[PDB]
Amino acid sequence: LVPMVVEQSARGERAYDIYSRLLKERIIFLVGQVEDYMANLVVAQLLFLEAENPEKDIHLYINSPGGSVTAGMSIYDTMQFIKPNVSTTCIGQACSMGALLLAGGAAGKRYCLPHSRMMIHQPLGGFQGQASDIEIHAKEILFIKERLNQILAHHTGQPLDVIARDTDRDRFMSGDEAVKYGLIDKVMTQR
Amino acid sequence: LVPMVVEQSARGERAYDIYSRLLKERIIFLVGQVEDYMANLVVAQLLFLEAENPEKDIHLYINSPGGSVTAGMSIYDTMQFIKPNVSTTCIGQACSMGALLLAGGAAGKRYCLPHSRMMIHQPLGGFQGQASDIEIHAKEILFIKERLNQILAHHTGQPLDVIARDTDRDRFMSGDEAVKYGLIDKVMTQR
Amino acid sequence: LVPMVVEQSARGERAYDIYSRLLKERIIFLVGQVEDYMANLVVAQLLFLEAENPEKDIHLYINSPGGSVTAGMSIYDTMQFIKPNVSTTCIGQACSMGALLLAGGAAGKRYCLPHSRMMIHQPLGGFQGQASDIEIHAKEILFIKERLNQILAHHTGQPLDVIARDTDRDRFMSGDEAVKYGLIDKVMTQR
Amino acid sequence: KLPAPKEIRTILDQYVIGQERAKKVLAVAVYNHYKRLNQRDKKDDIELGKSNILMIGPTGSGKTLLAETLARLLNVPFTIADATTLTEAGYVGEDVENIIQKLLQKCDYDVEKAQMGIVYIDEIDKISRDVSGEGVQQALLKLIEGTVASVPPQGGPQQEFLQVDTRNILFICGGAFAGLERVIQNRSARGGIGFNAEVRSQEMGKKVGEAFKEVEPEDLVKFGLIPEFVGRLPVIATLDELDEAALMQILTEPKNALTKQYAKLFEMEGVDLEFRPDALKAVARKALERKTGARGLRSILEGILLDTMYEIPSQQDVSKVVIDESVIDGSSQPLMIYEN
Ligand SMILES: Nc1ncnc2c1ncn2[C@@H]1O[C@H](COP(=O)(O)OP(=O)(O)O)[C@@H](O)[C@H]1O
Numbered sequence: 001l002v003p004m005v006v007e008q009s010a011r012g013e014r015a016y017d018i019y020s021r022l023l024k025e026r027i028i029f030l031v032g033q034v035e036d037y038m039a040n041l042v043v044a045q046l047l048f049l050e051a052e053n054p055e056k057d058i059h060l061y062i063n064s065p066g067g068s069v070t071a072g073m074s075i076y077d078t079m080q081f082i083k084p085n086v087s088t089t090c091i092g093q094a095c096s097m098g099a100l101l102l103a104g105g106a107a108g109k110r111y112c113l114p115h116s117r118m119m120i121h122q123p124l125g126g127f128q129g130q131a132s133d134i135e136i137h138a139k140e141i142l143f144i145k146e147r148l149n150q151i152l153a154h155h156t157g158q159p160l161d162v163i164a165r166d167t168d169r170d171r172f173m174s175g176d177e178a179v180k181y182g183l184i185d186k187v188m189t190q191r
Numbered sequence: 192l193v194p195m196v197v198e199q200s201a202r203g204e205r206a207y208d209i210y211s212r213l214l215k216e217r218i219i220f221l222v223g224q225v226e227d228y229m230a231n232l233v234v235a236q237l238l239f240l241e242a243e244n245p246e247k248d249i250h251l252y253i254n255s256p257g258g259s260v261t262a263g264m265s266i267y268d269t270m271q272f273i274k275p276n277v278s279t280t281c282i283g284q285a286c287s288m289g290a291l292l293l294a295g296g297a298a299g300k301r302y303c304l305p306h307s308r309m310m311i312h313q314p315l316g317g318f319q320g321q322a323s324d325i326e327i328h329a330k331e332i333l334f335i336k337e338r339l340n341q342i343l344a345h346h347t348g349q350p351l352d353v354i355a356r357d358t359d360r361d362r363f364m365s366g367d368e369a370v371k372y373g374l375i376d377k378v379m380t381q382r
Numbered sequence: 383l384v385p386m387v388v389e390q391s392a393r394g395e396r397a398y399d400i401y402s403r404l405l406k407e408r409i410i411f412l413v414g415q416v417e418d419y420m421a422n423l424v425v426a427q428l429l430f431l432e433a434e435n436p437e438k439d440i441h442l443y444i445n446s447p448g449g450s451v452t453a454g455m456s457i458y459d460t461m462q463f464i465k466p467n468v469s470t471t472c473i474g475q476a477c478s479m480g481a482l483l484l485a486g487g488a489a490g491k492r493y494c495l496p497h498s499r500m501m502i503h504q505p506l507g508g509f510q511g512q513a514s515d516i517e518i519h520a521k522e523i524l525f526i527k528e529r530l531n532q533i534l535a536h537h538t539g540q541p542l543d544v545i546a547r548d549t550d551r552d553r554f555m556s557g558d559e560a561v562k563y564g565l566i567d568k569v570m571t572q573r
Numbered sequence: 574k575l576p577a578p579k580e581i582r583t584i585l586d587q588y589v590i591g592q593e594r595a596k597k598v599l600a601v602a603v604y605n606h607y608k609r610l611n612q613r614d615k616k617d618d619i620e621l622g623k624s625n626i627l628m629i630g631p632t633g634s635g636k637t638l639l640a641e642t643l644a645r646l647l648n649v650p651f652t653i654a655d656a657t658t659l660t661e662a663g664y665v666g667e668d669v670e671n672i673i674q675k676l677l678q679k680c681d682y683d684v685e686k687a688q689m690g691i692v693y694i695d696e697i698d699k700i701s702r703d704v705s706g707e708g709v710q711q712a713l714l715k716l717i718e719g720t721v722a723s724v725p726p727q728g729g730p731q732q733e734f735l736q737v738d739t740r741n742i743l744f745i746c747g748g749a750f751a752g753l754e755r756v757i758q759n760r761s762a763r764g765g766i767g768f769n770a771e772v773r774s775q776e777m778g779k780k781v782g783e784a785f786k787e788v789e790p791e792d793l794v795k796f797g798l799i800p801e802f803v804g805r806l807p808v809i810a811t812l813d814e815l816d817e818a819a820l821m822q823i824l825t826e827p828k829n830a831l832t833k834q835y836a837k838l839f840e841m842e843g844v845d846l847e848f849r850p851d852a853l854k855a856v857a858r859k860a861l862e863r864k865t866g867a868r869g870l871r872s873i874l875e876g877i878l879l880d881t882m883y884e885i886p887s888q889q890d891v892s893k894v895v896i897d898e899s900v901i902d903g904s905s906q907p908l909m910i911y912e913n
C-alpha cells in the first residue's frame with residue numbers, strides 16, 4: 001500500500017500520497033519496465049511542471065531495466081524540448097533505455113549512487129514476416145541504433161566509433177567508470 | 192483490510208491508515224520480497240522524513256526473505272547518504288538482502304528480537320546466452336559479491352576473508368550469535 | 383462487504399469500519415493463514431495501542447489454522463515486549479501458531495469459547511538442495527522445534543519432555559482439557 | 574521631538590542585539606509617520622497616506638521589544654492587542670471596535686493622544702484563509718485604513734459614544750508566520766526532498782536565519798492573507814531567530830542584561846556575581862532546545878541562582894560566586910568564596 005502524508009500548509013491540512021508529495025518538489029519517478037503507459041505519465045508530469053515554473057529544474061530518478069524504445073524516446077525528446085533542465089540521479093540499475101535518459105540530463109546535473117550499475121547494449125527487436133518485410137524492419141532498427149549511438153556521443157563526448165564498439169556487447173560501468181566515460185558528471189557519496 | 196486510525200490532534204481529527212500513522216513517527220516497514228516497486232517506496236519515505244526532521248533518527252523494521260540486489264542497493268545507498276541515523280530492528284527473519292540492510296543501520300542502533308533468524312547467502316543470479324555473454328555476466332555477479340562482502344566487513348568489523356567463508360553457505364544466526372558477529376548491537380527482550 | 387459503523391462521539395459523528403471501530407477498544411483480529419503481510423498489521427496494531435494506553439489490557443482474538451513460523455514469532459515477541467497485558471480468546475480454531483499465540487498471553491487472560499478446538503504439532507518445513515544444504519536446514523528446523531517447546535513449557539508449566547511427546551503427532555484438545563494441560567486459564571461460557 | 578533615525582537606532586540598539594535590517598525600517602517608518610502628524614499645514618499636503626508595517630519574525634525574535642522600546646521613545650499611548658481574540662460580528666468573541674476601546678483606555682479618552690497612538694496587533698497569521706478567517710480580515714481592512722470610533726463611555730445614553738478617525742494611528746502588525754519558510758523556498762530551489770535538494774539544516778533555532786529577507790506580497794497571499802490586506806501593509810520588516818551566538822551577546826551586552834540585573838541584587842548583600850564565558854553559552858543552548866529562547870534565560874538562570882540566593886543572605890563574608898559551565902547543567906553547584 002502507498003502511504004499517505006499531510007502537507008500541513010498555512011491554507012490548511014491536505015493529504016497527499018508519497019508520490020504526489022514528491023512531485024510537488026519537481027521529482028519524477030521512473031520505475032519498472034519502460035512502456036507507453038508509464039512513459040506517458042512521465043511526459044505528462046514533465047509538461048505539468050513546465051507550466052508551473054519553466055526556469056526551475058526538474059529531478060528525475062531512473063531505476064529501470066529497460067523496455068520500449070519508442071516510449072523512452074518520447075521522454076528523452078520531451079526533456080530536451082522543454083525549457084527547464086532535467087537533472088538525472090540513477091538509483092539501483094540503469095539499462096540501455098535507462099542509461100539513454102540518464103545521459104540526456106543537463107550537463108553537471110547527472111548523478112548516480114556509489115553502488116549503482118549502468119549497462120548499455122544494442123537495441124532489441126523482433127518481428128515475423130516475409131523476406132521483404134524483414135529487410136524493411138532490419139533497416140529501421142539499424143537506423144534507430146545509429147541515433148542512439150549519436151545521442152550518447154553528443155552527451156558523453158566520446159567518438160561515435162567508440163560508442164558502437166562498447167554498445168556491441170553488454171558493458172557494466174560503475175559510478176567512477178561512468179564519470180570517465182562521460183555518462184555522468186558526479187558520484188554522490190554523502191550529504 | 193488495513194484499519195484506519197485517528198490522531199486526534201489539536202488542529203483537528205484526521206483519518207490515517209495504520210501504516211501512515213506510524214510513518215509520522217519516522218517509521219518505515221519493509222515486508223515481503225525486495226523488488227523495485229516496494230523498494231522505491233522506502234526510498235521516497237526515507238527522503239521525505241529527512242526534510243521534516245533531518246536530525247531525528249529513523250526506525251526501519253526488516254522482515255523479508257530477500258530479493259533484487261539492485262533494489263536493495265538503492266535503499267542501503269540512500270540510508271548512508273542521508274544525515275539522520277537509520278535504526279534497524281529485525282523482526283521475524285532477515286535473509287541475505289535483509290541482513291545487509293540490518294547491518295547498514297547506524298552504529299549502536301541495530302536491534303533484533305529474541306526469536307529472530309538472520310541468514311546470509313551469496314547473491315542469486317540467472318542468465319542465458321553465448322559464452323561471451325556468460326563471461327561478461329559472470330564478472331558482474333562476482334564483482335557484486337565482493338562489494339557486499341566489503342559492506343558487511345565495514346559495519347560488522349570482521350575481516351573480509353571471514354565474510355567470504357561464511358557467505359559461501361547458508362548460516363543461521365540467532366540474536367546472541369549476531370551480536371558477537373557484529374551484525375547487530377543489542378538484543379531487546381522487554382521494555 | 384465490510385459494513386460501516388458510526389461512533390457518534392460528543393465532538394461529532396465519525397464513520398469507521400467494523401474492524402476499525404473495535405480497534406479503538408484495544409481489540410485485534412487474527413484471521414486466516416499466518417503470513418508476513420497480515421502479521422505485520424497485527425504488530426503495527428499492537429504498537430499503536432501501546433502508545434494510546436500502555437496500561438490498559440489488549441484482547442487478541444485468534445482464529446487461524448497456522449502458517450509461517452517467522453511471522454508468528456514477530457507477534458509473540460511483540461506481545462511480551464510491550465508493557466500492556468495482551469489477552470487471548472480462542473474463537474474456534476488454533477492449529478500450530480494459534481495455540482502458541484493463545485498460550486503466550488498474560489497469565490489469567492487466556493480464554494476459549496465453549497466449543498473451540500485447539501491443536502499442537504511440530505513445525506512443518508519444506509526445502510530441496512544438496513546434502514550439505516539439507517543438513518544445515520535440518521539443524522535449523524530442529525532448533526526451532528526446541529525453542530517452540532520451551533515457550534509452551536514456560537507458559538503452561540509442563541515439563542519439556544511432555545511437550546515434545548505431545549507435539550510428535552497431531553493432538554486435539556477441547557476447552558476443558560486445555561485448562562488442565564495449562565494452555566489456557568478459563569473457559570468463557572456466559573456473560 | 575522628531576529624533577533622527579540614527580539616534581532612534583542607537584537607543585533601540587541598547588537592548589535589541591542584531592536587528593539592524595528591521596531597526597532602520599522601523600526607525601524611518603515611525604519618523605515619517607510622526608512627521609505627518611507634525612506636517613498638518615494647509616498647503617495641499619494633508620493627503621499623505623500612512624504606511625503600516627508588517628513585522629515577521631520567529632517567536633521571541635524581539636518584535637515586541639522593538640514595539641515596546643520604541644513606544645517609550647515616543648512617550649505617548651501604546652498598546653498590544655492580540656488578533657486571536659477578535660472575531661467577525663454575529664458570533665461570540667471580541668469585536669473589532671474593542672481594539673479601539675482598549676487602545677483609548679491607555680490614552681485617557683483624549684482624541685489628540687488617540688490619533689498620535691501606535692498599535693502592535695499580534696498573531697495576525699492566525700487569521701488566514703466562513704468565520705474567524707476572511708470575515709475578520711474584511712472587518713479589519715476598513716479599520717486599519719479608515720474608520721470612525723464607537724468606544725462606549727467609561728463609568729457613569731447611547732449617544733454618549735465617542736468618535737475618532739483611524740487614519741493617523743500607525744497600525745503595526747507583528748506575526749510569527751509558521752510555514753512561510755516553505756513558501757519562500759518555493760520561489761527558488763523548491764526542492765525539499767531528494768539528493769540534490771535544499772533539505773533544512775536542522776530543527777533548532779538555526780532554520781530561519783535570513784529566510785524572510787526574500788519575502789514578497791505574493792507569498793503572503795498564498796499563505797492565506799487577503800490580497801487587499803497584504804496591500805494595506807506596504808512595509809514588511811524581518812527579524813532574526815536569536816540563535817546561540819545572539820543569546821551569548823544578549824545575556825551580558827544589553828543595558829538590561831539578566832546578568833547585570835542579577836548582579837545588582839547580589840551586589841547589595843556584598844557578593845560579586847561572576848560568570849564564565851562558557852557558562853553563559855551553556856544557558857543559551859539549554860534555552861534553544863527548550864524552545865523558550867529569550868523567555869528561557871530568566872527561568873534557567875533562576876534555577877541556577879535562586880538556590881544560592883536563599884543561602885547567600887544567611888552566609889556572611891561572601892565575596893564572590895563563580896558560576897561554572899558545570900553549574901549551569903545539573904552536575905556541580907555554584908562555586909562560592911565562603912570567606913573573603
Ligand atoms: N535582544 C533582546 N534583548 C533583550 N530581551 C529580548 C531580546 N529579544 C527578545 N527579548 C525578550 O523576549 C520577550 C518576547 O518578546 P518578542 O521577542 O518581541 O516577541 P514575543 O513576545 O512574540 O516572543 C520580550 O519580553 C523581551 O524582553
Ligand SMILES: [Mg+2]
Nearest residue numbers: 633636637638
Ligand atoms: Mg514579548
